[PDB]
């Protein structure tokens, strides 16, 4: 079965300093759909970490779920930061605010810009992430 992929194109104006040095790019990573994927500074709490004192120890999390009467995998995004708002397009998520992720959207937190694009697949037990470099700003 094909696997749903969350393709995240990521940018930071200071990325040349090593902000994304722990991220493997253009390599799909598979997760069970009962896992929660976390992004942040603390590598004991987050599968994905940014080398940045500005980043909260957990910044945000992806929460896979299924709508009723639907066979595809949806994802909530939830802001875990008490200090830094998370922008999803023009929607601002405060602390512990969550929303369903659109199929294509721009995430902003601090100086970070993430273009997230969901490509549905048929597997219900797994999903994959994929990270893409951008030398120039997305926004």
């Amino acid at each position: 079965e094909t696997v749903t992929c969350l393709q995240m194109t990521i940018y930071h104006p200071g990325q040349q300093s090593g902000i994304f040095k722990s991220i493997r790019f253009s390599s799909k990573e598979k997760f069970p759909s009962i896992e929660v994927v976390k992004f942040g500074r603390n590598s004991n709490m987050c599968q994905y970490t940014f080398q940045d004192k500005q980043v909260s120890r957990i910044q945000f999390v992806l929460q896979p779920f299924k709508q009723f009467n639907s066979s595809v995998l949806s994802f909530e995004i939830k802001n875990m930061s008490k200090k830094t708002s998370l922008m999803v397009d023009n929607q601002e998520l405060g602390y512990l605010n969550k929303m369903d992720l659109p199929y294509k959207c721009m995430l902003r937190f601090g100086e970070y810009q993430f273009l997230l694009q969901k490509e549905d697949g048929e597997s219900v037990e797994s999903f994959e992430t994929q990270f893409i470099m951008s030398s120039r700003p997305l926004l």
Partner: protein, 135 residues
């Protein structure tokens, strides 16, 4: 009330002593999801072979405009349905919890009564083992 309290009652008709042997009197939890299942890495471990290692989760979150935590129950098992207030939920389906919640799964009956408190970072669950049916 400094913390939101979840008063949780549990019942099983025949396997109480083994199924609930690892249920603590209470659990104080943070803003991460609270996992329920038969696995050793769950926060509420229920020792029933019909359960999945990860069977369901309780997720605290905030609605826009809210000063009180909400709770999202999501089904994590592939094996069976979890009834929540009359809706039979299956894998990765979810609903928010109300004030009184009637939850049944694989023979376990569970009541969750939510009393709101001030904390947006911490909540506490108290667990009662009922000798008699709850639902």
């Amino acid at each position: 009330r400094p913390l939101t309290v979840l008063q949780v009652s549990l019942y099983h008709p025949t396997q109480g002593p083994v199924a609930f042997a690892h249920v603590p009197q209470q659990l104080q939890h943070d803003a991460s999801r609270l996992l329920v299942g038969r696995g050793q890495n769950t926060h509420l471990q229920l020792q029933l072979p019909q359960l999945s290692r990860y069977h369901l989760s309780l997720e605290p979150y905030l609605e826009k405009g809210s000063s009180l935590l909400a709770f999202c129950l999501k089904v994590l098992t592939r094996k069976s349905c979890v009834w929540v207030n009359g809706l039979p939920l299956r894998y990765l389906e979810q609903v928010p919890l109300g004030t009184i919640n009637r939850i049944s799964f694989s023979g376990i009956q569970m009541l969750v009564r939510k009393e709101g408190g001030a904390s947006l970072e911490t909540f506490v669950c108290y667990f009662h083992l009922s000798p008699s049916p709850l639902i």
